C-alpha cells in the first residue's frame, strides 16, 4: 500500500530538524542520492592525490573517482590505490593487466 | 633485501649543478614510486618530486619546478636528481625515497650531503 | 600547499612515560596521514601509515589516530631508543607537505 517515496524527502535534498520539511542539498559541496531522511547531505568526495577525476559531485550523485595512474584499488585493505606490479615474476606469464580496477594477472607457464 | 644505496657528499660551487644518484637493490624500481626530499641542515623536510619510472612520468612541487629534475635508469635501476643553478640556499641533505603507494615513503636512503659554497 | 603544523615543537618526557605528539592540518586530508621516525644523524623511518595502520617491523607501543585536520601519534611507554625527532605527512594533495617535527627530550 505505501510507496517508495513516502514518509521521505527525494534525492537531492535531506530532511529537516523539524521531521517534515525538506531541504536542498548544494550543489559542489554535498549531495544525496535517494528518497530519503537525511538529517544532513553527504560531503561530496574530492579526488585523492593518487586519483583522477571521473565525475563532478551533483546533488544527486557523488564524485566520482578513479586511481588510473599506473595503479589499481585493493579491496581487502582500506580501499586505496596501490602502485601495480611492472611485470610477472619467473615461471608466471602476464594474463591480466593493470587497470584502475586490478593489479596485473600472473598465472604459472605451467611449470612445475 | 630491500636497499637504496645513495650517492657521495657532493662539494659544489654557486652556479653548477649536480647530478644525484639512488641506486636501487632487492625489488625492481618499475613497481615503485620514487620521490626525491630535501632536509635543509637541521631543519624542515620538503618534498620536491615524484617519478613513475615505468613511465617516465614526473611531479613536482612548484617551488623547486625548473631547479630540480628527477630521471630514472630502468636498465641500471638507479633513480637519478638532476640539481641547477645552485645557492648557499640548497646546501642541504637530499633524501632519496621509495614507496608502493604514491602518497606515503615505505623506504628511504641514506641521504646525500650537498653543500653549496663559493 | 597544504600546511601541517606539529605541536608541541618539543617534549621534555622521561623514559616509561606515554607520549602524545599531535599534529594539525590546514584542510581536510581524510585518513591521508602518514608519522616517521627521525634519530639523530641517521635516515627517517616510517612509523604509521594512513592515521591509524601500523608498519611491520614497528614496537606495538606506537599508534596513531586521526581523521580531517586533527591526528595525533602515540608512544605509550618511551624507551631510550624513541627520543628522537618525529614528522607527520600528508598525501592527500599535491604538493606533498611535512609537519616541522616534533623533538622528544629526555626529563632529569
Known amino acids: 500500500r505505501s510507496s517508495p517515496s513516502e514518509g521521505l524527502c527525494p534525492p537531492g535534498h535531506h530532511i529537516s530538524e523539524d521531521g517534515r520539511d525538506c531541504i536542498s542539498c548544494k550543489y559542489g559541496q554535498d549531495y544525496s542520492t535517494h528518497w530519503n531522511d537525511l538529517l544532513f547531505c553527504l560531503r561530496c568526495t574530492r579526488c585523492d592525490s593518487g586519483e583522477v577525476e571521473l565525475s563532478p559531485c551533483t546533488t544527486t550523485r557523488n564524485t566520482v573517482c578513479q586511481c588510473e595512474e599506473g595503479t589499481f584499488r585493493e579491496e581487502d585493505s582500506p580501499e586505496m590505490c596501490r602502485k601495480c606490479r611492472t611485470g610477472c615474476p619467473r615461471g608466471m606469464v602476464k594474463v591480466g593487466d593493470c587497470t584502475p580496477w586490478s593489479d596485473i594477472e600472473c598465472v604459472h607457464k605451467e611449470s612445475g | 633485501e630491500v636497499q637504496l644505496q645513495q650517492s657521495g657528499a657532493e662539494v659544489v660551487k654557486p652556479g653548477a649543478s649536480v647530478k644525484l644518484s639512488c641506486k636501487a637493490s632487492g625489488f625492481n624500481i618499475k613497481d615503485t614510486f620514487i620521490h626525491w626530499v630535501k632536509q635543509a641542515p637541521g631543519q624542515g623536510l620538503e618534498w620536491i618530486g615524484r617519478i613513475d619510472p615505468a613511465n617516465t612520468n614526473t611531479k613536482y612541487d612548484p617551488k623547486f619546478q625548473g631547479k630540480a629534475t628527477i630521471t630514472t635508469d630502468t636498465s641500471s635501476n638507479t633513480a637519478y636528481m638532476e640539481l641547477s643553478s645552485l645557492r648557499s640556499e640548497d646546501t642541504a641533505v637530499y633524501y632519496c625515497?621509495?614507496?608502493?603507494?604514491?602518497?606515503?615513503?615505505?623506504?628511504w636512503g641514506q641521504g646525500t650531503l650537498v653543500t653549496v659554497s663559493s | 600547499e597544504i600546511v601541517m603544523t606539529q605541536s608541541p615543537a618539543t617534549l621534555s618526557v622521561s623514559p616509561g612515560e606515554r607520549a602524545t605528539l599531535s599534529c594539525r592540518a590546514s584542510?581536510?586530508?581524510?585518513?591521508?596521514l602518514h608519522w616517521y621516525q627521525q634519530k639523530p644523524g641517521q635516515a627517517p623511518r616510517l612509523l604509521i601509515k594512513f592515521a591509524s595502520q601500523s608498519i611491520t617491523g614497528i614496537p606495538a607501543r606506537f599508534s596513531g589516530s586521526g581523521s580531517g585536520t586533527e591526528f595525533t601519534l602515540t608512544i605509550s611507554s618511551l624507551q631510550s631508543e624513541d627520543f628522537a625527532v618525529y614528522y607527520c605527512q600528508q598525501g592527500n594533495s599535491w604538493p606533498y607537505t611535512f609537519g616541522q617535527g616534533t623533538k622528544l627530550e629526555i626529563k632529569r
Open positions: 625515497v621509495r614507496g608502493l603507494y604514491t602518497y606515503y615513503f615505505d623506504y
Open positions: 584542510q581536510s586530508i581524510s585518513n591521508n
